Amino acid sequence: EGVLYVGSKTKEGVVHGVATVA
Amino acid sequence: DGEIFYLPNLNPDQLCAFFHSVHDDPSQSANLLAEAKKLNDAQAPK
Amino acid sequence: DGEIFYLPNLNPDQLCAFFHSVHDDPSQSANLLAEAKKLNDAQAPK
């Protein structure tokens, strides 16, 4: 029940995404 | 156990604002995440 | 590429600085990564 701050280490090198946990 | 939705479009203020509401009350997270997705979609700079 | 990293223990405000360094200086998104993961490391052990 929430969202997790997740990032992905890529070409740009950091993206800010969300892991939505039910 | 959850999936991921990246918002590389949203500036630090927007991006930080998403979880700011969420973390205060993780019940609206799904809604908030939506507006994050929706925002990401709304402005989606290519 | 695409090395996912989770910041569960960081709060909106903790993460705030990360974006700020990251969006202001993408040149160090990895060194910045270090700091968020550092911060997520710092406060992690409750």
Domain boundaries, chain C: 1-46
Q: Using CB atoms, pick whichever of A5, A8, A13 lies closest to residue C10.
A: A5
| Cα-to-chain-centroid distance, residue A1 | 16
Give the separation between CA B46 and CA C38, rounded to whole angstroms. 31
Instruction: List Cβ neighbours of B37 (8 Å cut-off, separation of 6 or more).
Output: B5, B7
CATH number of C1-46: 1.20.5.420
Q: What backbone phi and psi angles, to 5 degrees, belong to C45?
A: -80, 95
Tell me which residues of chain C, numbers 2 to 41, contact chain A at a CB-CB cutoff of 8 Å.
Answer: 2-8, 10, 15, 19, 22, 26, 29-30, 32-33, 36
B3-6: strand order across its sheet: B3-6, A15-21, A2-9, C3-6
Give the N- to C-terminal CA distance of chain A in Å, as an integer: 4
Q: Are C42 and C10 in contact (CB under 8 A)?
A: no
